[PDB]
Amino acid sequence: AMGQSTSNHLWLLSDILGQGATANVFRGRHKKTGDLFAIKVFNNISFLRPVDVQMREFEVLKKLNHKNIVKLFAIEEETTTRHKVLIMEFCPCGSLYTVLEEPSNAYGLPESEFLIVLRDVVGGMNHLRENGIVHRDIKPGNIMRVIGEDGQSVYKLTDFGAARELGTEEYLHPDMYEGATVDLWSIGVTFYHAATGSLPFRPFEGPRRNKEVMYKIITGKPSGAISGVQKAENGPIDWSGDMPVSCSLSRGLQVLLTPVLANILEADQEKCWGFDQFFAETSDILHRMVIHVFSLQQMTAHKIYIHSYNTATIFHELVYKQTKIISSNQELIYEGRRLVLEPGRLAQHFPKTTEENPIFVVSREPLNTIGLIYEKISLPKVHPRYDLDGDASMAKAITGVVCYACRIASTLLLYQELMRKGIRWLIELIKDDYNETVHKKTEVVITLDFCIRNIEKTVKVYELGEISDIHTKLLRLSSSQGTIETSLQDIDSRLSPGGSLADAWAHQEGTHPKDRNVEKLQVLLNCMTEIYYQFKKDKAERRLAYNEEQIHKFDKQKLYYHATKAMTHFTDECVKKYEAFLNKSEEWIRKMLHLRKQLLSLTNQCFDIEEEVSKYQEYTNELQET
Template identity: 50%
Template sequence: MQSTSNYLWLLSDILGQGATASVFKARRKQTGDHYAVKVFNHISYLRPYEVQMREFEMLRKLNHKNIVKLFGVEELGSTKQKVLVMEYCAGGSLLNVLEKSENAFGLSELEFLIVMECVVAGMNQLRENGVVHRDIKPGNIMRVVGEEGQSVYKLTDFGAARVLEDDEQFMSLYGTEEYLHPDMYERAVLHKPQTKKYGVTVDLWSIGVTFYQAASGRLPFIPFGGPRKNKEMMHKITTEKPKGMIAGVQHRENGPVEWSEELPVTCRLSEGLKLLLVPILANILEADQSRCWGFDQFFAEANDILHRTVIHIFSLQQAVIHKVYIHSYNTINVFMDAISQQTNIPAPGHELIYEGHSLELDLVQQVNVVPKTTEERPIILVSKDPMTPIGITYKEPDIPMFPPKFDLINDANLAKVVTSAVHQLLRITNSLMKCQDFILRGVYWMLAILKEECRKTTQQVTALNVKLNFCKDTWMIIQKINSLLPQMNLTEVGDVHVKLQSTEDFLMSISQNVQKSQKQLDLITAEWSKSNDIHHKDNIIGKVQVLLDKVSAIYHQLKKDRMRMKLQYNEEQIHKFEKIKMGIHAKKVLVLVRDDCVQKYHKLLTSVKDWMRTACDIRKLLGPIGEQVKNLNQNLENCEASLNKTLDHCSSKLHDEEQIVTKLTASTAHLDQKCFEMVIGMKQLKQEMEDISQELQKNNMIIQSGFQEA
């Protein structure tokens, strides 16, 4: 047990150790609360006094939520060793987080953005105080859990820090070699004579390496054999890196370097975030300090990402999940362009569906009118043209085989690789199953929208047929009048009959197209139902999770075995059996993913390609009908107006003729049979016209109501 006047700790409760100090978990004597104490060893006192005091003074003036807080400086018992009393970060370091098997391929997107936000905020505080850290790395970024359960990251270890303005330079060397700027690496690691001076941008290189590692789970620059074993090649890779490249890996001894300007496909970040992050990495992982961004530009670009809102999009025909990072004040037009950039679907071809309904957006409105989306509730993007599915891009992780030789250290290391691979396979399974769920959901909504369009079109056609039939009846009445009174001039409605016949043919064609579309939609619906039943009965995620739990339990056991370093005979046999079991479980996961999940996924991709091709054809067939129905309705209204006008004229004429015939027949002694029949016919026509007029008025109201509903 060690102690100062206010704090005590056990030497076994070590949190970290460096060249000049060790950090322990301590308790305050008065309250029992946890703190971190940094105890300096005798080597630290060999440094100049101002260097020894630098960290104390630095922490005293830094007060920020993303910088580990200094509570005081005390002395250790009679030795008078300096002890820094600091905030205790129970979550360990970012390095501890990255070393977890589930993060072997990088952090989740949400966690990465938290890291980015915290590091940027902490570094901004340092720059405002003119401080260069000089040892930024995952091990010096501590994690605590906030009040709402979210991670909060804090910069720590200011032993190498010093005050330096943007235009100042320094020559002293500090830092961890994998994260060192190449100029500093050449002198500090390779021990080559050099007169170069270093500016504040050396921290940006370290941030770039840290961000790349947080995003991918590995260092960006790796020579064959590793950075610590092949130092000359490490320096060569970082200094000869082509402009724009953010990673370089040498896969074989003396072999070429494989350069990359993108994050690896195994990275868990979305393409939308990569699109914004990669340019930042490319411009801070720049060996030439004159070409490297300054902190102002870095802060501006990083904060630009952090202040964007995320809109989740699922491209139905492509079967790809997207995240669009955009400012809430941008217009819908900018949003549509961003979708086009990620999907390669031209903006005029976009059709958006949200929660089963078509999403109509005004291009001049701001993005904040877009409904709230989540990873589970994206907007469905449908292209108006058929497309070939792309699907989820993934790389199946390698699962190493355990050698029969008993080796506690190697077995534990391999067990971690296997566990990490199974975690990745579970993520792949989740992605594929989520993609299938979105496909089925999107197709269901698309079918519902098309069926509703068919229903409305049928309703409109029915209404038009009612109007057409009354126009035809009116035409027949006028024809009877014309036959009764041939002296009437009815040439102005002579072409109405032709228009009515043409309209009737057109309506018949529309009805046939709608019926054909409905039959096709019914066929797709039946196929969709079968696929939906299969999908929802599939419990592959649960099966993989059970196997992952078994693999993880064995991994933890093998880690414990490694800590003991020596096992009894029976324990050794159990250890060997556990290795075999882990291999069996991992193979089962691989078979489940390959032979079950992936095959069903590709089968559904084939189906959605056929379904959406048919849906696009139906949409193209139904698309013009709306305008056609509108034109037909206008034509019928014109015909109706013309017929009504003629009918009114005929009614007046018929009334006059009726009076004339009545007077003539009254002045004669007996009624001529022909005149009598004419009078009777006129009265009947008059009654029919009145009935037709009343029915037209009544049905026009019904028709208008039908169009409004449609």
């Protein structure tokens, strides 16, 4: 074998991790402890030979300590070549680029993981600003990832400060492509990339020979837009000031994220934010807590980004901006019961919200049932070419699509299981509004009983005009009360099991966790992703043996069969059942809004008559005489 060594460290040249322009990164261990470290060996060191200036540049990075920055442990010299070797912190998981290489993140990172990336990157750059050093060359490849003690990812920076001695091509500022504006540029490109899984500004044949057109895209500067992609060869550029539909981010977050990118992605130094403005808006998002809310009327889940110190007034406002529901009509349901929120109640004392257990929202005004809005992405055509590079690229693509389909499928199941809960709670919450009307009826019933037989007694002792008038008046009330008594039993007949309102259809329509459709999709998805990582190990081998050449061709054909089998099961089973559940949901809503309209009126026809039987009890029942 072949491996370099040091006074305290040693490493094989086969354990290469990073191939830079100035230095190379190797997986190395310590001679004594055996603990793994990152070995940064300086290549091309001869025309410089610094032992005075650069030495102190390494003595400053040593004491530089932060959670969002890869730690530099020591500066040692190679045994033979006497090259300056940096003992860096080893990150077993890799970088942000490695994460984006996964098909599960082909259409953007998970929302929770994205918030971690945002939090760490901002914290890292801010710490570098405190020391004055500017990075600019901030790429997902320069953002390492480690697993913290709590299992959550922690992102760190590393490849910075190499501008004094010497941005990435797809992360270059237009004026830099030819202040701190050029630094904040690549950050937005990184942030968009992490949220989309794709670059913001893409030509047709990629950023290579057609990258001459790519510079025209950036210099085009459409201000508010954050995406410039041509869907055809040397055609027009499709602009967009919003994020793709395939984005895995919630609607609440996109509203806050969009203006951040738009104000850091333009050539104008007068329209672009500074690091203070950038830090302010970013820190604002990171501080906010999440309130899970599922609108039963629209069959849509929502994530309201609000501060803990904000009141319920702003909460109802934010819900309206995402659901188009007036605050005075936003009726809340939680944990099976109705939930009343005070206009000035802080967000710290809000109930425990989860994607699986949120705060349902029901309204009285008619709302169209929308459901989940996603992008219909079909499988890409697989070419019979043997191109190992192309076989690895298309493997990442075709697997990412199925990942998206499996992502939507689990969400479609989420919406249905959430629907069954909200409906089950609602019908029982309606019964609560039925039991109160009964108790608000019996109070009127007893009232007339001690008003009828009290005036029927006064006249049976044996004037007549007043007697007959009240008698007729009380009869027109006890009768009108009689029909309401019966019509409420009709409502109770509706609330009864199998009473044209029961949720028997909800358990007999869409898909259920018993079907295990997501697990079935994952099985095929595992078969594909296994082949994918294998094709990565085939691309690195440049060429394969005859035996491995055939296996590569076999698995490539089985990659299509796996994807096709999964895509069929998704549309013909998961989707179709969802369409059926969505249909009978919009029907039951109308039948429910109609009922609540009845019960409301029938209840209001008890309060107005409660005041009518109050102006008679204090009248003839109590005459006057010395």
